[PDB]
Design a protein around this motif. Structure first.
Motif, PDB file in Angstrom:
ATOM      1  N   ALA B   9       0.826  -1.205   0.000  1.00  0.00           N
ATOM      2  CA  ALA B   9       0.000   0.000   0.000  1.00  0.00           C
ATOM      3  C   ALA B   9       0.860   1.256   0.000  1.00  0.00           C
ATOM      4  O   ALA B   9       0.587   2.205  -0.742  1.00  0.00           O
ATOM      5  CB  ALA B   9      -0.949  -0.005   1.194  1.00  0.00           C
ATOM      6  N   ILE B  10       1.912   1.279   0.818  1.00  0.00           N
ATOM      7  CA  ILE B  10       2.812   2.426   0.820  1.00  0.00           C
ATOM      8  C   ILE B  10       3.546   2.523  -0.506  1.00  0.00           C
ATOM      9  O   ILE B  10       3.801   3.620  -1.016  1.00  0.00           O
ATOM     10  CB  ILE B  10       3.789   2.338   2.002  1.00  0.00           C
ATOM     11  CG1 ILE B  10       3.030   2.457   3.312  1.00  0.00           C
ATOM     12  CG2 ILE B  10       4.810   3.424   1.916  1.00  0.00           C
ATOM     13  CD1 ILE B  10       3.860   2.134   4.512  1.00  0.00           C
ATOM     14  N   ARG B  11       3.882   1.379  -1.094  1.00  0.00           N
ATOM     15  CA  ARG B  11       4.490   1.406  -2.416  1.00  0.00           C
ATOM     16  C   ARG B  11       3.556   2.053  -3.428  1.00  0.00           C
ATOM     17  O   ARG B  11       3.986   2.876  -4.243  1.00  0.00           O
ATOM     18  CB  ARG B  11       4.855  -0.008  -2.846  1.00  0.00           C
ATOM     19  CG  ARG B  11       5.547  -0.086  -4.180  1.00  0.00           C
ATOM     20  CD  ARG B  11       5.831  -1.523  -4.539  1.00  0.00           C
ATOM     21  NE  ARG B  11       6.598  -2.180  -3.493  1.00  0.00           N
ATOM     22  CZ  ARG B  11       7.920  -2.169  -3.423  1.00  0.00           C
ATOM     23  NH1 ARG B  11       8.652  -1.547  -4.330  1.00  0.00           N
ATOM     24  NH2 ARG B  11       8.521  -2.801  -2.422  1.00  0.00           N
ATOM     25  N   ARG B  12       2.272   1.706  -3.383  1.00  0.00           N
ATOM     26  CA  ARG B  12       1.310   2.312  -4.297  1.00  0.00           C
ATOM     27  C   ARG B  12       1.190   3.810  -4.059  1.00  0.00           C
ATOM     28  O   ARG B  12       1.175   4.597  -5.014  1.00  0.00           O
ATOM     29  CB  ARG B  12      -0.050   1.645  -4.143  1.00  0.00           C
ATOM     30  CG  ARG B  12      -0.118   0.244  -4.693  1.00  0.00           C
ATOM     31  CD  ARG B  12      -1.535  -0.276  -4.656  1.00  0.00           C
ATOM     32  NE  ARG B  12      -2.009  -0.444  -3.294  1.00  0.00           N
ATOM     33  CZ  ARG B  12      -2.096  -1.612  -2.680  1.00  0.00           C
ATOM     34  NH1 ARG B  12      -1.767  -2.735  -3.287  1.00  0.00           N
ATOM     35  NH2 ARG B  12      -2.528  -1.654  -1.427  1.00  0.00           N
ATOM     36  N   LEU B  13       1.112   4.221  -2.794  1.00  0.00           N
ATOM     37  CA  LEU B  13       1.022   5.644  -2.489  1.00  0.00           C
ATOM     38  C   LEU B  13       2.212   6.396  -3.058  1.00  0.00           C
ATOM     39  O   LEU B  13       2.053   7.472  -3.641  1.00  0.00           O
ATOM     40  CB  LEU B  13       0.936   5.864  -0.987  1.00  0.00           C
ATOM     41  CG  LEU B  13      -0.420   5.567  -0.382  1.00  0.00           C
ATOM     42  CD1 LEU B  13      -0.406   5.869   1.089  1.00  0.00           C
ATOM     43  CD2 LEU B  13      -1.440   6.401  -1.092  1.00  0.00           C
ATOM     44  N   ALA B  14       3.412   5.844  -2.908  1.00  0.00           N
ATOM     45  CA  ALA B  14       4.574   6.481  -3.513  1.00  0.00           C
ATOM     46  C   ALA B  14       4.455   6.512  -5.029  1.00  0.00           C
ATOM     47  O   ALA B  14       4.775   7.526  -5.659  1.00  0.00           O
ATOM     48  CB  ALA B  14       5.852   5.764  -3.093  1.00  0.00           C
ATOM     49  N   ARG B  15       3.990   5.419  -5.632  1.00  0.00           N
ATOM     50  CA  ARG B  15       3.855   5.391  -7.082  1.00  0.00           C
ATOM     51  C   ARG B  15       2.962   6.518  -7.563  1.00  0.00           C
ATOM     52  O   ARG B  15       3.224   7.124  -8.605  1.00  0.00           O
ATOM     53  CB  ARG B  15       3.305   4.048  -7.547  1.00  0.00           C
ATOM     54  CG  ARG B  15       4.280   2.903  -7.440  1.00  0.00           C
ATOM     55  CD  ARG B  15       5.524   3.150  -8.258  1.00  0.00           C
ATOM     56  NE  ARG B  15       6.389   1.978  -8.277  1.00  0.00           N
ATOM     57  CZ  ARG B  15       7.395   1.777  -7.440  1.00  0.00           C
ATOM     58  NH1 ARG B  15       7.707   2.663  -6.512  1.00  0.00           N
ATOM     59  NH2 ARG B  15       8.105   0.660  -7.536  1.00  0.00           N
TER      60      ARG B  15
ATOM     61  N   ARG C  15       2.175   5.680 -14.389  1.00  0.00           N
ATOM     62  CA  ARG C  15       1.123   6.192 -15.262  1.00  0.00           C
ATOM     63  C   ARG C  15      -0.233   5.608 -14.896  1.00  0.00           C
ATOM     64  O   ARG C  15      -1.240   6.326 -14.893  1.00  0.00           O
ATOM     65  CB  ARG C  15       1.456   5.914 -16.721  1.00  0.00           C
ATOM     66  CG  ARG C  15       2.523   6.829 -17.269  1.00  0.00           C
ATOM     67  CD  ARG C  15       2.856   6.494 -18.705  1.00  0.00           C
ATOM     68  NE  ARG C  15       4.123   7.088 -19.109  1.00  0.00           N
ATOM     69  CZ  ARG C  15       5.308   6.530 -18.900  1.00  0.00           C
ATOM     70  NH1 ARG C  15       5.423   5.363 -18.290  1.00  0.00           N
ATOM     71  NH2 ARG C  15       6.403   7.160 -19.312  1.00  0.00           N
ATOM     72  N   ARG C  16      -0.281   4.315 -14.566  1.00  0.00           N
ATOM     73  CA  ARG C  16      -1.558   3.708 -14.214  1.00  0.00           C
ATOM     74  C   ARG C  16      -2.167   4.370 -12.990  1.00  0.00           C
ATOM     75  O   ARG C  16      -3.363   4.673 -12.974  1.00  0.00           O
ATOM     76  CB  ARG C  16      -1.395   2.214 -13.966  1.00  0.00           C
ATOM     77  CG  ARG C  16      -2.615   1.579 -13.330  1.00  0.00           C
ATOM     78  CD  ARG C  16      -2.303   0.191 -12.835  1.00  0.00           C
ATOM     79  NE  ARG C  16      -1.773  -0.638 -13.909  1.00  0.00           N
ATOM     80  CZ  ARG C  16      -1.080  -1.752 -13.724  1.00  0.00           C
ATOM     81  NH1 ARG C  16      -0.806  -2.201 -12.509  1.00  0.00           N
ATOM     82  NH2 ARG C  16      -0.644  -2.428 -14.783  1.00  0.00           N
ATOM     83  N   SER C  20      -5.793   6.918 -12.555  1.00  0.00           N
ATOM     84  CA  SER C  20      -6.982   6.544 -11.801  1.00  0.00           C
ATOM     85  C   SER C  20      -7.001   7.242 -10.446  1.00  0.00           C
ATOM     86  O   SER C  20      -6.062   7.943 -10.065  1.00  0.00           O
ATOM     87  CB  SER C  20      -7.054   5.025 -11.612  1.00  0.00           C
ATOM     88  OG  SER C  20      -6.179   4.597 -10.587  1.00  0.00           O
ATOM     89  N   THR C  21      -8.093   7.029  -9.706  1.00  0.00           N
ATOM     90  CA  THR C  21      -8.353   7.784  -8.489  1.00  0.00           C
ATOM     91  C   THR C  21      -8.878   6.970  -7.313  1.00  0.00           C
ATOM     92  O   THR C  21      -9.186   7.561  -6.276  1.00  0.00           O
ATOM     93  CB  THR C  21      -9.359   8.903  -8.774  1.00  0.00           C
ATOM     94  OG1 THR C  21     -10.459   8.369  -9.519  1.00  0.00           O
ATOM     95  CG2 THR C  21      -8.708  10.003  -9.570  1.00  0.00           C
ATOM     96  N   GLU C  22      -8.995   5.652  -7.427  1.00  0.00           N
ATOM     97  CA  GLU C  22      -9.546   4.883  -6.324  1.00  0.00           C
ATOM     98  C   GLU C  22      -8.594   4.899  -5.132  1.00  0.00           C
ATOM     99  O   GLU C  22      -7.434   5.295  -5.237  1.00  0.00           O
ATOM    100  CB  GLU C  22      -9.825   3.442  -6.749  1.00  0.00           C
ATOM    101  CG  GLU C  22      -8.609   2.690  -7.248  1.00  0.00           C
ATOM    102  CD  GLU C  22      -8.397   2.852  -8.740  1.00  0.00           C
ATOM    103  OE1 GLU C  22      -9.395   3.042  -9.468  1.00  0.00           O
ATOM    104  OE2 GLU C  22      -7.232   2.792  -9.186  1.00  0.00           O
ATOM    105  N   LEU C  23      -9.108   4.468  -3.984  1.00  0.00           N
ATOM    106  CA  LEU C  23      -8.324   4.480  -2.756  1.00  0.00           C
ATOM    107  C   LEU C  23      -7.175   3.486  -2.834  1.00  0.00           C
ATOM    108  O   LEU C  23      -7.287   2.429  -3.460  1.00  0.00           O
ATOM    109  CB  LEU C  23      -9.207   4.155  -1.557  1.00  0.00           C
ATOM    110  CG  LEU C  23     -10.306   5.179  -1.332  1.00  0.00           C
ATOM    111  CD1 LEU C  23     -11.093   4.860  -0.085  1.00  0.00           C
ATOM    112  CD2 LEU C  23      -9.685   6.549  -1.250  1.00  0.00           C
TER     113      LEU C  23
END
Lengths: 88, 78, 96, 98
Positions: B9-15, C15-16, C20-23
């Motif tokens: 999840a933190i990886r995604r937030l950084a992405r 880019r993906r 997008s904007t979901e949580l």
DNA sequence: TCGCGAGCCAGGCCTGAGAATCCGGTGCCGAGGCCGCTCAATTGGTCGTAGACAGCTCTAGCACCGCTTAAACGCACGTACGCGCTGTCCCCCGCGTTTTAACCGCCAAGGGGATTACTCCCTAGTCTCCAGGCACGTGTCAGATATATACATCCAGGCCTTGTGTCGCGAAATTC
DNA sequence: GAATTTCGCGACACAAGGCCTGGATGTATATATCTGACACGTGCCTGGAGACTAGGGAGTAATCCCCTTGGCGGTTAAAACGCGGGGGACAGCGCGTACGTGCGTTTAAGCGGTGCTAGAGCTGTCTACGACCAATTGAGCGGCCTCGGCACCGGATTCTCAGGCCTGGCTCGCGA
């Protein structure tokens, strides 16, 4: 980095080298250490081993025994430590 | 439960933020930062709620807790 | 087999997610975290669902902004990988 | 033989001296003329109370000092000692002023 | 240094695997419209007063002048540090496999949010009194300013030490 | 075997780093002077305080219902772990130019005094303007319906990263 005399001493087993062959020890300091009783390289090696390879204790003993200063003690300690790592 | 903020999840937030390469000590630091910020929001939300003699932390209280600190939030007003 | 050099999958993910904007935090772990933190101030608090939604939106936006500023700091120091020192500097300059 | 400090010590003496004192660091008249020049762009023929110009100068000096503290932190971050225009631009961009 | 054999690396052609996108179909539920209502906006009149305007006073903002010197300016010089580059290594990244718990729909209970009625006490409002605090004048000592003095500190010069290079001379090899 | 000459030894010399010592410098410290800014006394007057009243706002109970908590069963998408590897972080070294340092020169800022008048500030009049309240009505909110823009799903078509292979030039190395 390292003196040539240091490399020559560390390359081969000390055997019967005179104390003056040690890196960081000149004629005056060698003469003083001979006068104190330490007349051979292995004697200084054993004294180093007794202190369990502690840098500060070895340098302080060397300073109090003949009057060596920071550079001379550092060179002698480095040479002896490397000799131990190579033969001991 | 702070370990609930999973490392992916933190990886995604950084992405999302435009980061490309993430260190390894970053995850604990982010968990600490998130803990601090959540404390500083929930404290004010709970204070507002305790004031009105309610036991339910409604949405407007959270919006006001944010609005105090400068991070105005739209969409839940209310 | 077929395998991308590291860095390209990062760009595709970038880019993906910027499209997008979901949580980006799973809802239930965050809900339990919120209740745990509030458990030290008032004991019997019941959160409206939309209140937890707003809390989560605020936290995600704050963290995204923080990582934006940290990335600027990291690129400043001729690096590409962020570090805890980067985040600490960003928070220090921001005024916290 | 001549007395000539190594580059670096005079900087530290000046840093201590200027962190121990509190007087204003910009000469008064140049700043006053600058303030009037800027004000004339909006409405002409304005008059400034002297205390007002003093308050403006205090605000400007405090702002620049804060900016340079943050810029110095940014520069030390990049493992340098010099501050550069990119350091100032980064400090401002993080602070949110731009 | 060239001839020539052989291999290593640079770059383009080509393809493949996977992703992004475009196209079409189905369905679905949320946006846009329509009706009933009801209460908030509208209009009209009155009336108390906020502030627009005119006028006078007098303060301070502006412009000017001259003098003195603190500071800015320009220049020269040294060095140290920012930038470039390279080599090292380790540690995030990409992927596959396993595990696990988030998500979804459904249930049901009741805690508490929201609404309404009645009551009462807390406060705005007014009057009357009076002293706490503001503006003014006057004294004195805390800090500004100077002076000299003592001492911590920075930086350079001097002397000890080790390490090293080197050449006349000792020790050994060579030829006649 | 002798003479001579080349390789190694000690005296001579030099270079680099460290320890000892001292001067110039700036900082801390004590002593003296003085002056203006803070502390204090006093008149008054406007704002604070006490009494008393009316009424409306908030407290508190009663009541409904809604929506939050809890739990359960399936189902997956997503987290957890491991491993190979390649690219990025990091240290180190060299340079050159750009910034610190200091000194002579200019310059314009700062301090002092004066002149003045434009405008801040205070006061007096009174008129236009906004509060307030009663009647009223239509604009906008609540609820129901429907249907089409869009989410979802599948399926093609183009795009994009990667690499493998071939061509080409470059380089390395031994002998003439």
């Amino acid at each position: 980095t390292t003196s040539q005399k240091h490399r020559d001493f560390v390359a081969e087993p000390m055997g019967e080298k005179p104390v003056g062959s040690l890196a960081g020890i000149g004629e005056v300091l060698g003469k003083k250490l001979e006068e104190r009783g330490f007349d051979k390289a292995y004697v200084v090696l054993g004294q180093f081993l007794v202190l369990k390879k502690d840098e500060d204790l070895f340098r302080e003993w060397l300073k109090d025994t003949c009057g060596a200063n920071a550079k001379q003690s550092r060179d002698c300690f480095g040479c002896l430590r490397e000799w131990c790592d190579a033969f001991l | 439960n702070i370990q609930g903020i999973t490392k992916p999840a933190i990886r995604r937030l950084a992405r999302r933020g435009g980061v490309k390469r993430i260190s390894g000590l970053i995850y604990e630091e982010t968990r600490g930062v998130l803990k601090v910020f959540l404390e500083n929001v929930i404290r004010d939300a709970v204070t507002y709620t305790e004031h009105a003699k309610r036991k339910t932390v409604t949405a407007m209280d959270v919006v006001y807790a944010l609005k105090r600190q400068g991070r105005t939030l739209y969409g839940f007003g209310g | 087999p077929h395998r991308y050099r590291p860095g390209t999958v990062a760009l595709r993910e970038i880019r993906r997610y910027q499209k997008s904007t979901e949580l980006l935090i799973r809802k239930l772990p965050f809900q339990r975290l919120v209740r745990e933190i509030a458990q030290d101030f008032k004991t019997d608090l019941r959160f409206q669902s939309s209140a937890v939604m707003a809390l989560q939106e605020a936290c995600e936006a704050y963290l995204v902004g923080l990582f934006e500023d940290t990335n600027l700091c990291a690129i400043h120091a001729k690096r590409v990988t962020i570090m805890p020192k980067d985040i600490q500097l960003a928070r220090r300059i921001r005024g916290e």
